[PDB]
C-alpha cells in the first residue's frame, strides 16, 4: 500500500496472507469469507506471462496477522489448502477480466478477536454503495512505493471513480466486472495498492446495517500511486453467482 498508514489491531480481521512455502515469501493478499473459504484474485495463482501457476501444495494461508514478517504466536493461524478454484472465464490474456479465485481450506479456522469473516454483497448493497465518490478501504502487506516493505499491515481509504474517468486513464479495455478507485490529481490526497497487495479486499462499511462488505478484490494497476492512474478491482457482486456455485457444489 502506498501512502497509507498502519492498521489498528483487529481492524481487518478477514485479512489473509497468501504465503509461498519455499522460498518463504509474501505472494498476495486474500480475504476470509467463512471458516473454510478464502477469496483472492485469480492472477495471484495463475498468470502465464510471468510464469505463475501455483498449485495447492505450493502455498499456505496465514490468518489473523498484523506483523508482515513475524510468526505471531498465539494470534495467527496457518492453514493448508484443499483446493483452488479459478473462474473458468478469467481472461489472463487481455485484461484480467473476472479476476477471482476461491481457496477451500483443509480444516475450518476458529474465529477470534483477530480472525473473523467479511460479508459478501447482495444486489441491493452493491447498488447502494458502488457509486462514484463513495470510499472503500484497501489493506495489505505489499510495497510502500512503486520503485520499501512495511513492518505491519497497511491500510488506505480510496474513492470509487466514475467509469468514464477509469476508461480514459488507460489503454486496457475495461469491463463491467471491474471498477477503479483512487484520488484524482486535482484532489490532492493520494494512495494506492501496490505489488503484494493483489488479491486483498476492497471493503465498504454499510451505513444501513453497520457491517463490512467486500465489494472488490485488488486486481491490476499500471504502476502504483501515479498521478492520473487508478487501481482496478474485481467487482465481487457481479461474480457472486460463480462464488455461490462453487461453494454450493464443493463446500462442506
Amino acid at each position: 500500500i502506498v501512502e497509507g498508514s498502519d492498521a489498528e489491531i483487529g481492524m481487518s480481521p478477514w485479512q489473509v496472507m497468501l504465503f509461498r512455502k519455499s522460498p518463504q515469501e509474501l505472494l498476495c493478499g486474500a480475504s476470509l469469507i467463512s471458516d473454510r473459504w478464502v477469496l483472492t484474485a485469480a492472477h495471484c495463482l495463475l498468470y502465464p506471462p510471468w510464469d505463475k501457476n501455483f498449485t495447492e501444495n505450493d502455498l499456505l494461508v496465514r490468518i489473523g496477522k498484523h506483523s508482515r514478517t513475524r510468526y505471531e504466536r498465539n494470534i495467527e493461524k496457518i492453514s493448508m489448502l484443499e483446493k483452488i478454484y479459478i473462474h473458468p472465464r478469467y481472461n489472463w490474456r487481455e485484461n484480467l477480466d473476472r479476476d477471482i479465485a476461491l481457496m477451500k481450506l483443509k480444516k475450518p479456522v476458529a474465529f477470534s478477536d483477530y480472525i473473523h469473516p467479511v460479508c459478501l454483497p447482495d444486489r441491493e448493497t452493491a447498488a447502494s454503495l458502488l457509486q462514484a465518490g463513495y470510499k472503500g478501504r484497501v489493506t495489505g502487506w505489499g510495497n510502500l512505493k512503486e520503485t520499501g516493505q512495511p513492518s505491519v499491515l497497511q491500510v488506505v481509504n480510496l474513492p470509487i471513480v466514475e467509469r468514464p474517468v477509469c476508461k480514459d486513464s488507460t489503454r486496457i479495455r475495461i469491463t463491467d466486472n471491474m471498477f477503479c478507485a483512487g484520488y484524482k490529481p486535482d484532489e490532492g490526497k493520494r494512495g494506492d495498492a501496490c505489488e503484494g497487495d493483489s488479491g486483498g479486499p476492497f471493503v465498504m462499511k454499510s451505513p444501513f446495517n453497520n457491517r463490512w462488505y467486500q465489494m472488490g478484490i485488488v486486481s491490476w494497476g499500471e504502476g502504483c500511486d501515479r498521478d492520473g492512474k487508478y487501481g482496478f478491482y474485481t467487482h465481487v457482486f457481479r461474480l457472486k453467482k460463480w462464488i455461490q456455485k462453487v461453494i454450493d457444489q464443493f463446500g462442506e
Partner: peptide, 28 residues
C-alpha cells in the same frame, strides 16, 4: 450470521480511526 462485525470494533461499539471518512463519503 455475524459476518462483517469486527470483535474489537463493532462488537464492542468502538470505531476505528478512519471509518468515519468512509461514512462521510456515503452522502447520497
Amino acid at each position: 450470521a455475524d459476518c462483517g462485525l469486527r470483535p474489537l470494533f463493532e462488537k464492542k461499539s468502538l470505531e476505528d480511526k478512519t471509518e468515519r471518512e468512509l461514512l462521510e463519503s456515503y452522502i447520497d
